[PDB]
From a paper:
AppA, the Escherichia coli periplasmic phytase of clade 2 of the histidine phosphatase (HP2) family, has been well-characterized and successfully engineered for use as an animal feed supplement. The E. Coli periplasmic phytase, AppA, is a 1D-6-phytase (EC 3.1.3.2) and initial hydrolysis preferentially liberates the phosphate at the 1D-6-position on the inositol ring. The catalytic proton donor is found in a second, short, conserved motif with sequence HD positioned such that the aspartic acid residue functions as the consensus proton donor in the catalytic mechanism.
As phytate is rapidly hydrolysed by wild-type AppA, our efforts to capture crystallographic snapshots of its complex with the substrate by soaking crystals with InsP6 were unsuccessful. This was the case even at pHs where the enzyme retains minimal activity in solution, yielding only the structure of the orthophosphate (product)-bound complex. Utilizing this structure as a proxy for the enzyme in the covalent intermediate state, the structure of the wild-type enzyme with InsS6 as representative of its complex with phytate, and the structure of the complex of the enzyme with orthophosphate as representative of the complex with the second stage product, we can now build on previous descriptions of conformational changes occurring during catalysis to describe snapshots during the complete structural catalytic cycle of the enzyme. Notably, the involvement of R20 in stabilizing the phosphohistidine intermediate and its interactions with bound orthophosphate in the product complex explain why loop opening does not occur until after loss of the second stage product.
Numbering used by the authors: 5 to 410
Write the structure that this text describes.
């Protein structure tokens, strides 16, 4: 028997409109990209509704776990929400509060200035710290198989799948090539290189374009749009093949520990603060920690960074995107009653693509997907695979980068 004492949820924001619409995306397909109901990068109403489903589900299961009351609003900081400054993250926090505790108006805290980046969600972005250029380069290239040419060489079945969905042979980038005595290939038409600077890593060309476009197809599906990918994505094998290109870029750029440890350090500190038993104390964002429930509205990069830094690996059954809209990395502190010891469990909770496509209300009898994770570095584990509080504490202390803390 274990008793749930605390939960921290790091969530990607919900479904949002594509953040840019470029000439290159026009040039790789003869077809017209469907337009979205909100501004570039904003949360869609359906995106908010899907988040509220997770909030409602989390209320049900946390009531069943005895952590929140069945009726009424949580009292005095029992639930806290922090969100990145972006509209889509702020609105994700509002949607989660609306599902978790409807009509309770739980405050969605942000940093003071909502017009500039919050270093909690990436300390490299405000120059708190810097990447190690040489070491990051070598690390990403090794994980790519030794070169980006080697990386794309194995993924060419998936690139051909993307070309079919695009009808790439009939695109402007194809047809305006000269001459035509040569076949059309995304990877060869758009050579891909790794670019590393003190504040960012990125991939150029086909690799980054493919990661973006396959995510757009998935967002079209989750948004309920009539025919994602111009109706040329027709079974789950095709979805899994397409999104493998997106997961592969995040594996290189955001999971690689030489990037992830730095980029995740502020979130590691906040998470460890929320999970550690201590007298309640007002801290960052004016939130009092520890408390019962902390929900943090961030981004796919944050999920990937935390997984890379903590050595948490996952694939999501029925959800082709490893870092899907509204995907939740769920940290829990459990007290084992046999000796009143403290234990940390980590999970990935997510809506399957069909649960998004169908706008399926979630509940105890229709739950989201959930993957139980293990901290690979943990040396002190209980019968349920949880890491001891002290073991988890050492892992975070070893994984974090002190220069990157706030
Ligand atoms: Mg339970
Ligand atoms: Mg406040
Ligand atoms: Ni993703």
């Amino acid at each position: 028997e274990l008793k749930l004492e605390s939960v921290v949820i790091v969530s990607r924001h919900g479904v949002r409109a594509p953040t840019k619409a470029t000439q290159l995306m026009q040039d790789v397909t003869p077809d017209a990209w469907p337009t979205w109901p909100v501004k570039l990068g904003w949360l869609t109403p359906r995106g908010g509704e899907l988040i509220a489903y997770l909030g409602h589900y989390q209320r049900q299961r946390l009531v069943a776990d005895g952590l929140l009351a069945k009726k009424g609003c949580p009292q005095s900081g029992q639930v806290a929400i922090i969100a990145d400054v972006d509209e889509r993250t702020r609105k994700t926090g509002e949607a989660f509060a609306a599902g978790l505790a409807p009509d309770c108006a739980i405050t969605v805290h942000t940093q003071a200035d909502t017009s500039s980046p919050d270093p909690l969600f990436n300390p490299l972005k405000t120059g708190v710290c810097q990447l190690d250029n040489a070491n990051v380069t070598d690390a990403i290239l090794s994980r790519a198989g030794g070169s980006i040419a080697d990386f794309t060489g194995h993924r060419q079945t998936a690139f051909r799948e993307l070309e079919r969905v695009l009808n790439f042979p009939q695109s402007n980038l194809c047809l305006k090539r000269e001459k035509q005595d040569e076949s059309c290939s995304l990877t060869q038409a758009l050579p891909s290189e790794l670019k590393v600077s003190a504040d960012n890593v990125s991939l150029t060309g086909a690799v980054s374009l493919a990661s973006m476009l396959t995510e757009i197809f998935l967002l079209q599906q989750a948004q309920g749009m009539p025919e994602p990918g111009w109706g040329r994505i027709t079974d789950s094998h095709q979805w899994n093949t397409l999104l493998s290109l997106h997961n592969a870029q995040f594996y290189l750029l955001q999971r690689t520990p030489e990037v992830a440890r730095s980029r995740a350090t502020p979130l590691l500190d906040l998470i460890k603060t929320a999970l550690t038993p201590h007298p309640p104390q007002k801290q960052a964002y004016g939130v009092t920690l520890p408390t019962s429930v902390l929900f943090i509205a961030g981004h796919d990069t944050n999920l990937a960074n935390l997984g890379g830094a903590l050595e948490l690996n996952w694939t999501l059954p029925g959800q082709p995107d490893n870092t899907p809209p509204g995907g939740e990395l769920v940290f829990e502190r459990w007290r084992r009653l046999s000796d009143n010891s403290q234990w940390i469990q980590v999970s990935l909770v997510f809506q399957t693509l069909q649960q998004m496509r169908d706008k399926t209300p979630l509940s105890l009898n229709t739950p989201p997907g959930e993957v139980k994770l293990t901290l690979a570095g943990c040396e002190e584990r209980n019968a349920q695979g949880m890491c001891s509080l002290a073991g988890f504490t050492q892992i975070v202390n070893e994984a974090r980068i002190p220069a990157c803390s706030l």
